[PDB]
Design a protein around this ligand. Structure first.
Ligand SMILES: NC(=O)CC[C@H](N)C(=O)O
Ligand SMILES: NC(=O)CC[C@H](N)C(=O)O
Ligand SMILES: NC(=O)CC[C@H](N)C(=O)O
Ligand SMILES: NC(=O)CC[C@H](N)C(=O)O
Ligand SMILES: NC(=O)CC[C@H](N)C(=O)O
Ligand SMILES: NC(=O)CC[C@H](N)C(=O)O
Ligand SMILES: NC(=O)CC[C@H](N)C(=O)O
Ligand SMILES: NC(=O)CC[C@H](N)C(=O)O
Ligand SMILES: NC(=O)CC[C@H](N)C(=O)O
Ligand SMILES: NC(=O)CC[C@H](N)C(=O)O
Ligand SMILES: NC(=O)CC[C@H](N)C(=O)O
Ligand SMILES: NC(=O)CC[C@H](N)C(=O)O
Ligand SMILES: NC(=O)CC[C@H](N)C(=O)O
Ligand SMILES: NC(=O)CC[C@H](N)C(=O)O
Ligand SMILES: NC(=O)CC[C@H](N)C(=O)O
Ligand SMILES: NC(=O)CC[C@H](N)C(=O)O
Ligand SMILES: [Mg+2]
Ligand SMILES: [Mg+2]
Ligand SMILES: [Mg+2]
Ligand SMILES: [Mg+2]
Lengths: 150, 150, 150, 150, 150, 150, 150, 150
């Protein structure tokens, strides 16, 4: 990658539907060269895909949680427990962390009941779990994980 | 929205580049109807945009953090402190939460030094901050915020 | 329910002994209609009953506690442990909660000794309990659970 | 009070609408004597009133919280802060407690938004508040504060 | 007991060697009556004994600790664990408490090594112990447990 | 001090009323020598006094507490705050400690109300106090501070 | 640096007094080349100096502590507070850290009194300090900071 | 040891390469006497060795951690767990401590990955470990364990 690739990525992280002509006009480079650079970024794994940003509210995902998990330590518990947490419907983020907790889990549900049934009731039966503490999100001030270049 | 819209969104959340012909063939509906439904979803704000999923590793974003923030309480501190945290370069997520902490901040940096300079040194001067506790992410087990329909 | 039902309930939550004539005069509706609406609210389960508010002090219930419970996680522990806590004499409230604790228990006793014997000594033998932390209530500033309409 | 008064109260705490004839038949005492004893209990302040038990669900009170409050210490802060917390719409219980927190607050709201606006946004501006930690109630296992005699 | 007994006890809690003549002169009562009252207080168990207050420093007891204990819950653990803690040489106080810990232990030793050997190494092997947290006393501001009447 | 002094002190810490003849017979030394050694121990400050051990229960001291105090740091706060805590009626022990808290306070009261009025209400107004956490003693397993020689 | 430099450093980190002839014989290289490489490592700042490892016990440094510090946040508090902590006699390590605390301080003293006077009493007056928690080291299992190559 | 030995040690703790002539000139004593005193200090174990102070940065040791360990209590766990922690490559300090944790571990690694593999993955399999909390060092303000005489 170089300076040009970064300028292209800075645009694509926000609008993957911007036309080649418009991008070429903005960054000032041939459209053929632009297409070549983009294909190379995809081929090299820099661009792993293109997603539609869907408004969680439209799907009534109003029960947003950030759960901290304390594990029962054992050989390779981070991979085993991490994978069990990752396969729970509604869970989009699972992080192995340093601190008083071992994992931070990000999840979304429509209601308190769905959250209890799909998440809480599943987690309580996982053997590698010592206990968890769920922080309910009252307000999402910002959630733009797509922005990697500021 | 209806059952058809959900099937369309379930595909677009993963691959926004899938052709209309391929989607129409998969969900079994006219291409003209598909384009109409998609445009309506965009118009109604269900689909807020399309982003390229960039591999954070390609940008050397190896210093991943989840910071818990305790605020100095005051009238409307959640909005004021939330906005100050949201404008820090590298911060992609800011959540107002219930629990022993008031905000959870998600951020990415290339190094320990960049993290100290861009994030730590900025946060320590914000008047609404009482203190913070940063959990370093050793391993990202899963991070697919784009998936809203499981 | 409608606006009228709410006005009736707002009165009944405070004084269930208020005469039909007095209520009818206050909210301005026929006594026959009032009786009909009240019976329907009872039939529909909105009004589950009528209780006498007894002064806990008259019964010497001076040892008031709010106990936080950490559970030993397992399949359906919330229902099993919750029910074991609920059947302890003196316990009037049991809540399954989110946070560093799993249950919050509200109880009343006449003395420290009765509290130890009836509550502490029973809880310590429950297998689903990891540990508990009891907060002694020094002063009840307010306790009006009967008020559901402010 | 005596043994008879306790038997009367044990019934009234559950059903304040039970007829005098039925109560007299159950506890085995003259109806005239029963009415006299009941009036004396009311006069002496043992029975402070009669309330209708309304199903919180019927009022859509699905956002149930138990908030722990850490105060900024000062002369008589327990009374001053306690009273400010007690006047917040939706708050039915305020307890001055011993432990790592100073007050425990019980409240009910219909939604996350109402909770933020009516409770969170009011509490954050109270000068006597250092900070709070809210535990969201996922499931009410038991809530029968009316039972004072087990 | 009466007002006179309290005046006698208020003196004896400080100086058990004060002569009968001096006490009688101070509180203004016959020496014979004084001796009678004192003997009755001893007989009734109010006065359980007389001890010499020895300066801990003279015995080089410079390692003063207050240890909080978290227990592994079980039937009657408070009595069983309490008694095991009470028999450890150097331990003078063992309290079963409410809060995040279950016991508070007061102990004195001459050195860090003696403390580790006599206390730490014994406690770590007790099955009813989950863990402990020891607070080292840097300075004793006050320690007059003999004063029961202020 | 020597081996003989220790044997004398080991007896006096339990029974300061034991006669000279009985002590002399037990430890096997002349009564004149015993009296001389005892007087020297008093003169040298080893024996600071003699107290009557009064049963706290006889004085209805049923509200026993161990309060942890977090201070507002400042020059010499340990001495200033320590002395303010030490002069509160009912407080018999004040310890400056290492750990998450700065002082541990031992106190006794007859009731919850007396504890609130004499202790809680006084402590909340002390400027050097950040906050406190009170652990209520449910049961005193052991409290023999008089034993310095095991 | 290369493989040879690492082998030289692996020896020097343990014994800086080992003769050139002995080192040359061990790693198998000319003494002249060895001296050249060592001088270059010193010149390049890899080897910052040579110290005598003194047994702390010989200096009666028996009061070993690890203190966690919570700071009062402000612009550049990490540098300002860090430097104030670093200049305290007895303090050999000061670390700015991530977590519930902001600094970890390593210090050694001969006694409890010296620790209180030189460290505690100085730290309590530093304006940037909110509070501290000192962990007393009962036993040093290992302390070989000189080993950088395992 | 005496005053002269201390002056010699105060120099050697900083520069073990200072010539005998220079030291003798500085402290004002015969070179023969200086050599004798130094040899005696080594023989008596006061000076345990001489090490080269290597700049950790030169070895790319940028992942610096201070890990707190909670143990599963058992007979002699402090020695057994302490020794298991001490043998982990990268760990230079292991301290058995008083407080909410039982051990404090100091370690250095080149990267997050090396830290996870060499330290985290080894510690999670140790049976005596209940859990750990790692504090990442953002900045080393001071690290001069060689200074024992201030
Ligand atoms: N510049 C454009 O947009 C198209 C022509 C350009 N020369 C190319 O190579 O694509
Ligand atoms: N998994 C481990 O080995 C330790 C993880 C723990 N969260 C820590 O920070 O140390
Ligand atoms: N089905 C297709 O893909 C194209 C023709 C279809 N009838 C339409 O309306 O678009
Ligand atoms: N902002 C507030 O009013 C309180 C927020 C706090 N985190 C809580 O859970 O109560
Ligand atoms: N209004 C009253 O109180 C009684 C008469 C009224 N018309 C009724 O239907 O009950
Ligand atoms: N029961 C569970 O699955 C978790 C409950 C826990 N109190 C939490 O907040 O996460
Ligand atoms: N017992 C009753 O119910 C009514 C008659 C009874 N003798 C009385 O005094 O009321
Ligand atoms: N208000 C006070 O004085 C102290 C209250 C505090 N919650 C405690 O338990 O000590
Ligand atoms: N008062 C005294 O001290 C001695 C005489 C007194 N009348 C008595 O009965 O003991
Ligand atoms: N022993 C028990 O049952 C509970 C004791 C615990 N310390 C508490 O405060 O609840
Ligand atoms: N031994 C006694 O009790 C009294 C006589 C003894 N010879 C003395 O000197 O006191
Ligand atoms: N007073 C101080 O300087 C610090 C006291 C604090 N309790 C500690 O352990 O560090
Ligand atoms: N090898 C030695 O120890 C000395 C001779 C060697 N040729 C040198 O250059 O130093
Ligand atoms: N200094 C800061 O900005 C925050 C430091 C704090 N210890 C943390 O981990 O977040
Ligand atoms: N003083 C020196 O440096 C050398 C001579 C001195 N008289 C000695 O004994 O070593
Ligand atoms: N090992 C033990 O016995 C107790 C150690 C614990 N860290 C404490 O401070 O008490
Ligand atoms: Mg995206
Ligand atoms: Mg009611
Ligand atoms: Mg005494
Ligand atoms: Mg060294």
């Amino acid at each position: 990658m170089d300076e040009i690739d970064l300028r292209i990525l800075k645009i694509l992280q926000y609008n993957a539907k911007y036309s080649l002509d418009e991008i070429a006009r903005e960054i000032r480079i041939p459209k053929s060269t632009l297409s070549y650079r983009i294909k190379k970024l995809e081929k090299d794994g820099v661009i792993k895909g293109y997603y539609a940003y869907i408004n969680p509210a439209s799907l009534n995902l109003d029960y947003i949680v950030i759960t901290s998990v304390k594990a029962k330590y054992g050989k390779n518990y981070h991979v085993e427990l991490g994978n069990k947490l990752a396969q729970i419907p509604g869970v989009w983020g699972v992080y192995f962390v340093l601190g008083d907790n071992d994992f931070i889990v990000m999840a979304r549900y429509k209601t308190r009941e769905e959250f209890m049934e799909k998440f809480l009731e599943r987690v309580m039966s996982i053997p590698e779990v010592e206990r968890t503490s769920t922080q309910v999100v009252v307000k999402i001030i910002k959630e733009s994980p797509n922005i990697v270049i500021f």
